[PDB]
Amino acid sequence: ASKDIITMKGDTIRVSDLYKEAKQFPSQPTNTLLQNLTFDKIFTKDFGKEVTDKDVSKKVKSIKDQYGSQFSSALQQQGLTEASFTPYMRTQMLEQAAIDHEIKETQYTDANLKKAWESYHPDVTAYVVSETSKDAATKALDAAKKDDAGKASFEKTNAESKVTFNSTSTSVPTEVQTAAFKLKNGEFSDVIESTSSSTGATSYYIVEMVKTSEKGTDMNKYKKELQNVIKTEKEQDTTFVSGVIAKYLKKNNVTVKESAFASLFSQFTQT
Amino acid sequence: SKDIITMKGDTIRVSDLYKEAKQFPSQPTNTLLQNLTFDKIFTKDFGKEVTDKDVSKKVKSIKDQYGSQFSSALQQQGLTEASFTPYMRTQMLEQAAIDHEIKETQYTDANLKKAWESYHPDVTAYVVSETSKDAATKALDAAKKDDAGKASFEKTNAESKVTFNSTSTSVPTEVQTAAFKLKNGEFSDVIESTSSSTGATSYYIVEMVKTSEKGTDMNKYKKELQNVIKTEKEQDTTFVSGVIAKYLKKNNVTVKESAFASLFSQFTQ
């Protein structure tokens, strides 16, 4: 007795196809095995020639080399083996090829460019110094604004804190950025207070502008920069990715024949 | 069309796995195989003792007690009302094997004596709990004052008159110890009991109505002591894991698909 579980254009997932995934990921549930096996097929039909076995094994090695000794425990946290990581990375790379392509061909619309432009600020170079105690930051600032001598001490002492950031920075906090975009070259800021949402600590920043900047009135001057702002946001927007999946599902007429898994792609057929 | 797991007179094939996959799409392949194996090995020896009617009957009696909470009670466990019946079936088949192993090997004289050293039979008495010590002190003085205050205590705390033994979970040890020293009609002092779980301190008052003694014959309370050994062994994870390991080894359970090789490593070591 032979029976199809999922139907799509030019292909179909059978029980044998499921059991093959079950043997490769005994820890993963049936639902996941089906979802991943479906994505693998629909994304291989349009981006397979762009993600060869060499492209996969090459990226896997570059990642293994960065994690180093932690790579083993990094795969356990995900519930994978070094052997099952290659095929897992293959499906993740095929799925990523589809989202990257969709972002590039449809998200850089005038409406999104203007949305990003409303709060955008170009690169500025300046000394951004963090302190734990408020009293410490207050004395360090008074010593820097005292005279040109104390200013050189601040610049020599906090030499590694001289950075280049824009409105998309993750290292420089929003309170600091706002106070910094108001400074003139050579000007110092007040003791900026910033409470971290991740940890929960309260740091005290001091900023000295070196090279400031203005976006101006022409948005087209920073069109490439704004496209990269839209790119980094869409990649992190779970709603957008689920939408990309829903598209390729609808495109290949993916249908669940086994009523037992009816709500298999319910997480995507809502976006 | 290939065999995944082999055992005596039977085998788990891919079709058998896909049938479980459709019943528990959220559970992983490993779990589907383990449960499907236990279901088969325990059904081979205790299936006639736990029929589908025995399962659906107990399931209904539980659904009726939880009432409206039953839905949210199954979510906390990660189950549906439909997947609860077959889950209860495997739990009952596995329990039939543990109960049978306990009955045929754990009611040894050595274990009966171990249970008997701290056993005490049923006693009927008024057990009243209080939050503040001063409240319990006044309630007691009012009861031991005269026969009038004694009737007030018995009328007001009428539903506190209970029957407990040394295996009670509701009456704390400090209270039990002070109660087994009372004679019929006698009141206890304000008993202080500190909970090991929370950390709160209650103040109990006990009035004996019908006391009892275990005596010198342990055989008189044989059934009670067997139930003491039974409730302990069911909760000894080492013993239960041993029971599983036995039925696995007994049916020569073997994983043929090397992909699941270490499937029962957690049970057979």
What contacts A6, CB < 8 A, 6 or more positions away?
A12, A13, A34, A38, A254, A255, A256, A257, A258, A264
**Half-sphere exposure of residue A236, counting CA atoms within 13 Å on the CB side?**
6
Dihedral of CA atoms B25, B27, B29, B35 in degrees, nearest 10, equals -110
Select A121-211's CATH number: 3.30.590.10, 3.30.2350.10, 2.40.37.20, 3.10.50.40. Answer: 3.10.50.40
For residues A43 and A248, is the Cβ–Cβ distance under 8 A? yes
3 state SS for A46-79: HHHHHCCHHHHHHHHHHHHHHHHHHHHHHHHHHC
* Nearest chain A CA: its distance from B249 CA (Å): 23
Residue B191, beta-bridge partner list: B204
For residues B41 and B247, is the Cβ–Cβ distance under 8 A? yes
R_g of chain B computed on alpha carbons: 25
* Domain at B122-210: CATH architecture: Roll (3.10)
Q: Alpha-carbon distance B43 to B33, whole Å?
A: 15
Q: Tell me the two tokens of residue B176.
A: 């039990």
CATH topology of domain A4-110+223-264: Triger factor/SurA peptide-binding fold (1.10.4030)
What contacts B87, CB < 8 A, 6 or more positions away?
B79
What contacts A156, CB < 8 A, 6 or more positions away?
none
DSSP of B34-86: HHHHHHHHHHHHHGGGS-HHHHHHHHHHHHHHHGGGHHHHHHHHT--HHHHHH
For residues B165 and B212, is the Cβ–Cβ distance under 8 A? no
Domain B3-110+221-263 has CATH 1.20.58: no
Residue of B nearest to A23 (CA): B259
Which of A19, A25, A31 is the closest to B14 by Cβ?
A19
What was the resolution (in A) of this experimentally determined structure? 3.1
Residue A157, class by beta-carbon neighbours within 10 Å (0-12 exposed, 13-18 middle, 19+ buried)? Answer: middle
B3-110+221-263 and B122-210 have identical folds: no
For residues B107 and B229, is the Cβ–Cβ distance under 8 A? yes
H or E segment and range at residue B150:
helix B147-156
Q: Which residues of B touch A29 (CB under 8 A)?
A: 25-29
DSSP of chain A: ---EEEEETTEEEEHHHHHHHHHH-TTSBHHHHHHHHHHHHHHHHHHGGGS-HHHHHHHHHHHHHHHGGGHHHHHHHHT--HHHHHHHHHHHHHHHHHHHHHHHHHT--HHHHHHHHHT----EEEEEE--SSHHHHHHHHHHHHS-HHHHHHHHHHTGGGEEEE-TT-SSS-HHHHHHHTTPPTT-B---EEEE-SSS--EEEEEEEEEE-----S-GGGGHHHHHHHHHHHHHT-HHHHHHHHHHHHHHTT-EE--GGGGGGSTTTTT-
CA distances from B179 to A136, B190, B213 (A): 66, 11, 12
B207-244 burial: b if 16+ Cβ within 10 Å, else e:
bbbebeebeeebeebeebbbebbbebbeeeeebbeebb
Cβ under 8 Å to B: A residues 109-128: none
What contacts B114, CB < 8 A, 6 or more positions away?
none
Q: Which amino acid is at A21?
A: E
For residues B214 and B119, is the Cβ–Cβ distance under 8 A? yes
Taking an 8 Å cut-off on Cβ atoms, the answer to whether A258 and B14 are in contact is: no
Method: X-ray
* Residue ranges per structural domain of chain B: 3-110+221-263, 122-210
Compute the Cα dihedral for B129, B134, B135, B141 and give only its sign: positive
Long-range contacts of B50-58 (CB under 8 A, 24+ apart): B50/B89, B50/B92, B50/B93, B50/B96, B52/B89, B54/B92, B55/B85, B55/B88, B55/B89, B55/B92, B56/B85, B58/B88, B58/B92
Chosen from A13, A23, A24, A30 to mutate, greatest number of chain B CBs within 10 A: A30
H or E segment and range at residue B135:
helix B133-145
CA distances from B33 to A15, B20, B160, B199 (A): 16, 8, 49, 43
For residues B216 and B7, is the Cβ–Cβ distance under 8 A? no
A16 touches chain B (CB under 8 A): yes
Q: Tell me the two tokens of residue B121.
A: 């039979």
Q: Alpha-carbon distance B246 to B197, whole Å?
A: 35
